[PDB]
Amino acid sequence: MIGTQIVTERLVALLESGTEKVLLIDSRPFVEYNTSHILEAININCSKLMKRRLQQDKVLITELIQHSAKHKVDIDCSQKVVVYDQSSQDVASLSSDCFLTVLLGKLEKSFNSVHLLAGGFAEFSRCFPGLCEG
Amino acid sequence: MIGTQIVTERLVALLESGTEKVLLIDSRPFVEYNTSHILEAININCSKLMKRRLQQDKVLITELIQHSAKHKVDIDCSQKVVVYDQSSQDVASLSSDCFLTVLLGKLEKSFNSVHLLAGGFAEFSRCFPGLCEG
Amino acid sequence: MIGTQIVTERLVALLESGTEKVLLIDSRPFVEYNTSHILEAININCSKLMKRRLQQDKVLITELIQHSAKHKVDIDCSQKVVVYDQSSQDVASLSSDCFLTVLLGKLEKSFNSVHLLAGGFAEFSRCFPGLCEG
Amino acid sequence: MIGTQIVTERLVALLESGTEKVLLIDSRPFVEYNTSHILEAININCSKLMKRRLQQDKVLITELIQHSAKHKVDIDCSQKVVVYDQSSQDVASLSSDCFLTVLLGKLEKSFNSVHLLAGGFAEFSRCFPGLCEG
């Protein structure tokens, strides 16, 4: 896993353009997600069990994404994928074995461009409240 | 689905010099596969029942690829993927609603480089019988 | 250089439905190009002198592509690239040290998807004479 | 231009792995570069003139990279490219028309993975002094 980031302003620049198709993933607990999240973000359960099954490779990230979608999600390895939790500043500040870290590895294998959101939902919701759904 | 081909000879070249990881997909009936197939190739049942599940996006291709593997098949979008049937010369000569075309469409979505083997397992086993497996 | 092909028919399909940007490269002598070439195709002189400059990496392919364009050719690595000569059936039938093979090698380095047109400008102009340009 | 970042720790993780080939680009003035820079970083002159020629598309970024290399540089669109200046924190904190911003656009077009180093040479040299050359 390489691990790269995108900042809020640049994500919004990305969303506002008909340039790229974005897969937005919210890796927080569902109460948080259901409470508020970035528009059209897909909730991927931050479970300790799900982490085990992903690293056991008994679940595929592409499988989890689609099962987690209320919509019928488009899986396409050309989609720019942005992941976020509550307040992680960068990939380096993560522990080697946590869920988000595991999630990024699986994603970087199935998608060409995978980025963590700098500051997480905390910063994003702080800057663009009109872009969050409750 | 765009549809590109690789000729039998460039496949071997692609294999011999391990500069790229190759995912080899045998899309023929199980009996044809189990008889003889290109070394290390993965069999994806030519089931019209599996077809209908793919077009329904009720099963993902990478899911279907890992299910059809004895070893731990590494789903990685930067893998070069080569599909083969019995004796298809190229992608244009395929019907609009056949398993292969359905298979290639879903594969090109999950994988960067996806190629049909020009001539199928007919010409390959006709040229490199030592690279086949009983 | 791996070496993959696209058949005349899938090229047109690739063009008609603008879901991908296509870079069309005519690798024949200038007189052959100027007579008739596939619509919008860029001519890259088959010069043994240009060959030697490419293998010396004294001229870059994207440099050579923009030099050989009347319009502003957008060098973009995510462009689908299709090369053609007069009547080459596939990449395997090419000599190890010919311009085409040298051209494809450098192109695959600068571009994600690079394909030889199966049958060259012979079969294409034999099938879509309306998509040729005098 | 999308614009993404990589932090020092993750760049070093990237360099230390035989996983990916990295193109390291130093976009500062040459006195700074010659004074000290990250090992094997290629100096790309931060010139106001060069900025104009790049945006006029009269110079190609792939052309500039190779001309700027004391070594014979490998241009290959699969190379992970990390760019850095003195102390830019993220892409969003850049002005829309500055050189670095122009540089990132051109690079993102010729390379699949292009990232700005979070904090620039200032932070990198602050953390890994043994990885800088004077």
Whole-number Å distance between alpha carbons of D127 and D124: 5
Neighbours of C77 (CB within 10 A): 20
Residue D76 has phi, psi (to 5 degrees) of -160, 120
Q: Tell if the CB–CB gap between C7 and B92 is shorter than 8 Å.
A: yes
| Cα radius of gyration (chain D) | 14
Looking up residue B31, the CATH number of its domain turns out to be 3.40.250.10
SS (H, E, C) B5-43: EEEHHHHHHHHHCCCCCEEEEECCCHHHHHHCEECCCEE
Whole-number Å distance between alpha carbons of D60 and D55: 9
What's D74's DSSP letter?
Answer: P
Going through A27-128 in order, the beta strands assigned E by DSSP cover 37-38, 42-43, 80-84, 114-117
Residue corresponding to tokens 């997480």? A120
Q: Tell if the CB–CB gap between A7 and D112 is shorter than 8 Å.
A: no
Torsion angle of alpha carbons C85, C89, C92, C97, nearest 10°?
-20
| Residues B115/B80, Cβ–Cβ less than 8 Å | yes
Number of structural domains found in chain A? 1
Whole-number Å distance between alpha carbons of D48 and C5: 43
| Cα radius of gyration (chain A) | 14
Q: Tell if the CB–CB gap between D2 and A6 is shorter than 8 Å.
A: yes
| Residues D75/D67, Cβ–Cβ less than 8 Å | no
Whole-number Å distance between alpha carbons of C114 and B80: 13
Whole-number Å distance between alpha carbons of B41 and A64: 26
Residue corresponding to tokens 């359960």? A45
Whole-number Å distance between alpha carbons of B6 and B20: 15
Contact list in D for residue C65 (CB cut-off 8 A) is none
| Residues B98/B105, Cβ–Cβ less than 8 Å | no
How far is the alpha carbon of A122 from chain D, nearest alpha carbon, in Å? Answer: 18
Helix (H, G, I), strand (E, B) or coil at A25: strand
Lookup: tokens for B38: 């290109």
Query: Crossing angle of helices C48-55/C99-110, nearest 10°?
Result: 40
Cβ neighbours for A70, distance < 8 A, ≥ 6 positions apart: none
Cβ neighbours for C75, distance < 8 A, ≥ 6 positions apart: C62, C65, C66, C110, D60, D62, D109, D110
Segment (H or E) for D116: strand D114-117
Q: Tell if the CB–CB gap between B57 and A76 is shorter than 8 Å.
A: no
A-chain residue closest to D11, CA distance: A2
Of the candidates A108, A100, A84, the one whose C-alpha atom is nearest the C-alpha of residue A26 is A84
DSSP string, B62-126: HHHHHHT-SS-----TTSEEEEE-SS---STTS-TTSHHHHHHHHHHHH-SEEEEEETHHHHHHT
Neighbours of B61 (CB within 10 A): 25
Q: Tell if the CB–CB gap between B62 and A57 is shorter than 8 Å.
A: no
Neighbours of D83 (CB within 10 A): 24
Residue corresponding to tokens 């820079």? D37
Whole-number Å distance between alpha carbons of C73 and C126: 27
Alpha helices in chain C (DSSP H): 8-16, 30-35, 48-55, 61-67, 99-110, 120-125
Q: How many helices (H) and strands (E) does chain C have?
A: 6, 7
* Contacting partners of chain B (3+ CB pairs under 8 A): A, C
Helix (H, G, I), strand (E, B) or coil at C11: helix
A-chain residue closest to D118, CA distance: A5
* B and C: number of Cβ contacts within 8 A: 56
* Contacting partners of chain D (3+ CB pairs under 8 A): A, C
Cβ neighbours for B102, distance < 8 A, ≥ 6 positions apart: B51, B54, B55
Q: Tell if the CB–CB gap between C4 and B9 is shorter than 8 Å.
A: no
Of the candidates C20, C116, D82, A18, the one whose C-alpha atom is nearest the C-alpha of residue B108 is C20
Strand partners, D132: D38
D-chain residue closest to C108, CA distance: D76
| Residues D132/D40, Cβ–Cβ less than 8 Å | no
Alpha carbon D9 to its chain centroid, in Å, reads 16
Segment (H or E) for B51: helix B48-55
Domain extent at residue D62:
1-134
Whole-number Å distance between alpha carbons of D17 and D28: 26
Show contacts of B70-74: CB within 8 Å, 24+ apart.
B72/A57, B73/B23, B73/B42, B74/A109, B74/B21
Neighbours of A97 (CB within 10 A): 9
Q: Tell if the CB–CB gap between C112 and D111 is shorter than 8 Å.
A: no
Lookup: tokens for D40: 């094997």
* A and B: number of Cβ contacts within 8 A: 41
Cβ neighbours for A124, distance < 8 A, ≥ 6 positions apart: A8, A11, A38, A84, A117, A131, A132
Q: Tell if the CB–CB gap between B110 and A72 is shorter than 8 Å.
A: no
Of the candidates C127, C79, C100, C101, the one whose C-alpha atom is nearest the C-alpha of residue C26 is C100
Lookup: tokens for A72: 């019928």
Whole-number Å distance between alpha carbons of C60 and C67: 10
| Residues A20/A80, Cβ–Cβ less than 8 Å | yes
From the list A60, A72, A75, the residue facing B66 with the nearest CB is: A60
Whole-number Å distance between alpha carbons of B95 and D84: 51
| Residues B37/B68, Cβ–Cβ less than 8 Å | no
Lookup: tokens for A16: 């506002």
Q: Tell if the CB–CB gap between D8 and A92 is shorter than 8 Å.
A: yes
Cβ neighbours for C98, distance < 8 A, ≥ 6 positions apart: none
Helix (H, G, I), strand (E, B) or coil at A133: strand
Strand partners, B38: B132
Half-sphere exposure of C16 (CA within 13 A, CB side): 10
How far is the alpha carbon of C106 from chain D, nearest alpha carbon, in Å? Answer: 9
Q: If interface means Cβ-Cβ distance under 8 Å, which residues of chain D face chain A?
A: 2-10, 13-14, 19-20, 80, 90-92, 112-113, 115, 118
Residue D21 has phi, psi (to 5 degrees) of -90, 125
From the list B10, B90, B112, the residue facing C92 with the nearest CB is: B10
- Degrees to nearest 5, angle at CA D21 with D16 and D23: 100
